[PDB]
Inverse folding.
């Protein structure tokens, strides 16, 4: 992860201020609303016909928290994303059959959610470092696909 | 948009394909699964081994739909309507994948049609598959 | 394709942008050049330093073309015909880059319009920018 | 660039049969015919208005030969694509201002050209190996962009 010290530092300080429960739920929710076809993996979560239904769905919120929690743990392993997410990569491929393009879409939604939450503080340099992290995570999650 | 010359090129090339369509569809699929393994996530219920009957059967279906689009080249959005609904509402394949299959179909045609696959025809076919992909993806949201 | 609700969401969000369009346009550009450095290849004649007047002026132009698109939402291909010709025949920017600018404009809006950037409006704006990109690359070949 | 020994053998074997001069001219020409916007870099090459004008243009043929010669050289250094192409990467970014997406388009056109020339011999497994190689070269040429 060709991350610069000033870049690593930017990611870390911002993240220390994130409410993972809220952001996770908001990220996964926006993904399902903005890119409707991603709902194909979540038929069993219930009603998702409208944005209000998606955003309020308790299983959506809870799954978002779990996803972002694993993302969070990965931010402590920025020198070894591949090794950290290897097991998860295999599961996403072998059991869940999730097209990795989904990981890129969530990345970008995540970035929009961070900007929405932090406004001013989410300056261009800070976005740039986060784009590198989100692509890094997506790439590690896809690494074990075969 | 397809130009008159593009339409001519596509009918000519596809006419040479003729009764091999199905076979070329299946090859395009195998090529795709091997070159771009992430595409396999959409076919967990298939046997994907070489010579698989499910792969053969699905190849024919894909090839028949392309034949139909060629037969209705001036009315593609309507000729492919049903398929557009299916992809948008049920299958929900990420749009990037269409570019991958299209590439593999072009490779397949190139490999089997040495004399027809001129630069001009290559260009028209690429445009044709891109328009088909656009239609199939037009109702996604 | 844009639904009525989409058009209503887009007009209202852009309405709140108001006199800040120019500034946001410039901000979206700066975010793009930093996040996606390959985009700088299309602007070798620009001083790309923070606060440059070329980025500022270009941000205004981009922003105003979007305003015109919002104002002409039902008739975009005609309202943007000249820009569509410009990108296809002169500038010849690779289509992939349009998604990068679109994402950066969304991030800009999200950062500046917290109450207005609801999940449904986020969806509408994403579809609108996608449509605008489609129109701008529709004459490429 | 994870290439298995059997993939590397397949790539090298086929490449030994390629007339780089001819294939270079075809690939570059086809790029300019199929993706007409890539002509923005070659306005000094003269007439590029029709397929025959592009394909028979002596400057296109000569540039194609130069491009593919560098690419072959790369096939002799599969384990160090990044180092091999470092100075060319710099040049394409700082002096020529070429959007790296162009390297990916050329890679896919080259794959169609190999398919066209070799027919049957360009089997699905052989194509898969070439797809990894063209992506590897594209990635190496992009690595010095900033
Ligand atoms: C930031 C990227 C992502 C990370 C870090 C992540 C992480 C996780 C984790 C930790 C689990 C729990 C697995 C377990 O209990 O063993 C999971 C499950 C799952 N993930 Fe991902 N995820 C990501 C993105 C996605 C996306 C984009 C999709 C599809 C849109 C997806 C689909 C699923 C599905 C379908 C499950 C199984 C849910 C169930 O138990 O019913 N994931 N993910
Ligand atoms: C040239 C573009 C494509 C065309 C013309 C096409 C056409 C078709 C047709 C005719 C069917 C059969 C529907 C029926 O039974 O009535 C089908 C189904 C299907 N397609 Fe598409 N398709 C295309 C691209 C793709 C791609 C890119 C993917 C994802 C990689 C995909 C995934 C599927 C899947 C998973 C099925 C269901 C297979 C099954 O369960 O039997 N298709 N398509
Ligand atoms: C929403 C998408 C976009 C819109 C609405 C847009 C609109 C415009 C406008 C209004 C102009 C000025 C034309 C004039 O001076 O009259 C322009 C020029 C230009 N645009 Fe696009 N643009 C978009 C995306 C892009 C992207 C993605 C790129 C490449 C990264 C790009 C590169 C350029 C360049 C290089 C110029 C010429 C700038 C100059 O020399 O001053 N544009 N565009
Ligand atoms: C396989 C990928 C490629 C390789 C290995 C490659 C290699 C080369 C080499 C060896 C040169 C000559 C360098 C010099 O003059 O010092 C060159 C020049 C150049 N390349 Fe690339 N190239 C590749 C792809 C492309 C693509 C796809 C484009 C644009 C679509 C491009 C645009 C150019 C241009 C405009 C020049 C300068 C031509 C001139 O002399 O006027 N290259 N490249």
């Amino acid at each position: 992860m060709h991350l610069t010290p000033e870049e690593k530092s930017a990611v870390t300080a911002l993240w220390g201020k994130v409410n993972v429960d809220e952001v996770g739920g908001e990220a996964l929710g926006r993904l399902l609303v903005v890119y409707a076809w991603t709902q194909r993996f979540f038929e069993s979560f219930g009603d998702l016909s409208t944005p209000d239904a998606v955003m309020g769905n308790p299983k959506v919120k809870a799954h978002g928290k779990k996803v972002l929690g694993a993302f969070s743990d990965g931010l402590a392993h920025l020198d070894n994303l591949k090794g950290t997410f290897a097991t998860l990569s295999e599961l996403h491929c072998d059991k869940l059959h999730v097209d990795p393009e989904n990981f890129r879409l969530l990345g970008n939604v995540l970035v929009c959610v961070l900007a929405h939450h932090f406004g001013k503080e989410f300056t261009p340099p800070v976005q740039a470092a986060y784009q590198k992290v989100v692509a890094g995570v997506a790439n590690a999650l896809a690494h074990k696909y075969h | 948009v397809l130009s008159p010359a593009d339409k001519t090129n596509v009918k000519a090339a596809w006419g040479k394909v003729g009764a091999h369509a199905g076979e070329y569809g299946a090859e395009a699929l195998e090529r795709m699964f091997l070159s771009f393994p992430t595409t396999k996530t959409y076919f967990p219920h298939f046997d994907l081994s070489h010579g698989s009957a499910q792969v053969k059967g699905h190849g024919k279906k894909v090839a028949d739909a392309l034949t139909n689009a060629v037969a209705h080249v001036d009315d593609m959005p309507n000729a492919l309507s049903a398929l557009s609904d299916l992809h948008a509402h049920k299958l929900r394949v990420d749009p990037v994948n269409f570019k991958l299959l299209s590439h593999c179909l072009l490779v397949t045609l190139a490999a089997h049609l040495p004399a027809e696959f001129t630069p001009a025809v290559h260009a028209s076919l690429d445009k044709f598959l891109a328009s088909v992909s656009t239609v199939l993806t037009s109702k996604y949201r």
Q: What stands out?
A: Helices of chain D lie at 5-15, 20-34, 51-56, 58-75, 81-84, 86-95, 101-118, 124-142. Chain D has one domain: 1-146.
